[PDB]
């Protein structure tokens, strides 16, 4: 199956009392695996199969790295806020990571946000930074003047990240590589609507849709979000509105982890 590894950073200038000015957590797929913030000042595991497979040396080394990254993140946000000429509290975010797809191909990505909007986006194939405005453009110029850092990032994204991912995938294989099939039902809810409802499934990736007469995909389908049920499985739904003057026959189609399912109504 397709898997991904990513690390986020969040920086806040002038945070309210108690709230950390810096947070960083990693994920494998939807599972948190590591966390760090400016209060604890420690990198800690957020999944049992991480703590169990990475020696204290790992947590110690990356804790020191993160303490450095925390400082630099503050200086960078400070610089952005100065250049935007912004007062008050603003956010800085980063996301780095990679995907290993089923067919064995890979992707890698690195990008930044200011106040929750794209700011800088890395292209590891053109070895360049996309800038969304002239504040970002100034940073792009400084960053692109340092060719080694770009090369380094391409290497980390394409080789190291994928190696880390395969490693964590092995650590958590009992969780990450299991399959729990969906339980699927259709519910009727002066207008009638058919709800196709799935629950109990893992992984959270699932494809649900409505077809009419088995030949055409229905336009105007309301899609529900894939939601955590809290027990490590997920639930989702999709609905369509019925036309009493139409002679259409409907069916729910669900695809999950290589199995297709049809519920004819």
């Amino acid at each position, epitope marked *: 199956r397709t898997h991904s590894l990513r690390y986020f950073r969040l920086g806040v200038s002038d945070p309210i009392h108690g709230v950390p000015e810096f947070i960083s957590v990693g994920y494998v797929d939807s599972h948190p695996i590591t966390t760090y913030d400016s209060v604890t000042r420690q990198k800690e595991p957020r999944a049992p199969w991480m703590a169990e497979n990475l020696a204290p040396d790992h947590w110690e080394r990356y804790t020191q790295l993160l303490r450095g990254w925390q400082q630099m993140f503050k200086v960078e946000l400070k610089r952005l806020q100065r250049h935007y000429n912004h007062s008050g509290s603003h956010t800085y975010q980063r996301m780095i990571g990679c995907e290993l797809l089923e067919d064995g191909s890979t992707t890698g990505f690195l990008q930044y946000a200011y106040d929750g909007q794209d700011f800088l986006i890395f292209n590891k194939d053109t070895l360049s930074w996309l800038a969304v405005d002239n504040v970002a453009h100034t940073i792009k110029q400084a960053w692109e003047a340092n060719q080694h850092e770009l090369l380094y990032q391409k290497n980390w994204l394409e*080789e190291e990240c994928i190696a880390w991912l395969k490693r964590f995938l092995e650590y958590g294989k009992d969780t990450l590589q299991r399959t729990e099939p969906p339980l699927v039902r259709v519910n009727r809810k002066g207008v009638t609507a058919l709800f196709c409802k799935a629950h109990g499934f893992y992984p959270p990736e699932i494809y649900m849709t409505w077809m009419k007469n088995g030949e055409e995909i229905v336009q105007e389908i309301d899609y529900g979000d894939i939601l955590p049920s809290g027990d490590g499985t997920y639930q989702a739904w999709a609905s369509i509105e019925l036309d009493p003057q139409s002679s259409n026959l409907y069916s729910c189609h669900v695809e999950h982890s290589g199995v297709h399912m049809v519920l004819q109504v």
Partner: antibody, heavy 109, light 113 residues
Framework: GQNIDQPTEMTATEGAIVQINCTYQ??????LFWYQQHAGEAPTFLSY??LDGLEEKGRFSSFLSRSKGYSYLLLKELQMKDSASYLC??????????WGAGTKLIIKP | GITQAPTSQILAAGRRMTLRCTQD?????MYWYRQDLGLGLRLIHY???????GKGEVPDGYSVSRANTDDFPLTLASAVPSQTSVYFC?????????????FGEGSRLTVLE
């Protein structure tokens, strides 16, 4: 990582070319550095490689092959002032810089 | 740039020595290495930014502090013969990226019983 290997000493002639090798076994790779260190003095930065191929800087070039786990530092048109130790260092998966034992380059006038 | 002091020193085993290191380049990362014949540079202690420090490969017998960006003193609480070595302080704008190290002049220490 675990091992960075480079020859203890090399001797070449003034005006010629020398290739100083550095092989590495590490857990993870985030780039390879070359430093020059004259006897009794501080190391100074020469080069950094992290993708494959050859990168030139004046009389010195630095090559890397990740798949083979090695790099060389190439010195052309040797001069007496190139007499020095040349140190190899690799950043591993934890970004720990791991240093080879250095190669002492002797030049015959 | 970066300055190390003192640069040459004889020491009775048991004495407390502090090697000074300062840079005004505003580098966040600073390092203490010892260099010994036949070995690659070995890291003693390091600091990625002010207010934190970490242990290197051979921390034992040594301690550091980093209350500020500029200074990174290496203290030997009670020197021993095996601590005869050449000590290099080095700094880098940031830890763990492609930016190179800038080395101090080196400090030659001989600890004698």
């Amino acid at each position: 990582g675990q091992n960075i290997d480079q020859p203890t000493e090399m001797t070449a002639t003034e005006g010629a070319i020398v290739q100083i090798n550095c092989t590495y076994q590490t857990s993870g790779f985030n780039g390879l550095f070359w430093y020059q260190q004259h006897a009794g003095e501080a190391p100074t930065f020469l080069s950094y490689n992290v993708l494959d191929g050859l990168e030139e800087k004046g009389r010195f070039s630095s090559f890397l092959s990740r798949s083979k786990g090695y790099s060389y530092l190439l010195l052309k048109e040797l001069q007496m002032k190139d007499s020095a130790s040349y140190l190899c260092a690799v950043m591993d998966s934890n970004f720990q810089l791991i240093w080879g034992a250095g190669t002492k380059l002797i030049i015959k006038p | 740039g970066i300055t190390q002091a003192p640069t040459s020193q004889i020491l009775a085993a048991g004495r407390r020595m502090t090697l000074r290191c300062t840079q005004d380049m505003r580098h966040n990362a600073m390092y203490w290495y010892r260099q010994d014949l036949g070995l690659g540079l070995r890291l003693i202690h390091y600091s990625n930014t002010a207010g934190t420090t970490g242990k290197g490969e051979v921390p034992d017998g040594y301690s550091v502090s980093r209350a500020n960006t500029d200074d990174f003193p290496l203290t030997l609480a009670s020197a021993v013969p095996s601590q005869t070595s050449v000590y290099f302080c080095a700094s880098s704008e940031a830890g763990g990226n492609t930016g190179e190290l800038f080395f101090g002049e080196g400090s030659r220490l001989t600890v004698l019983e």
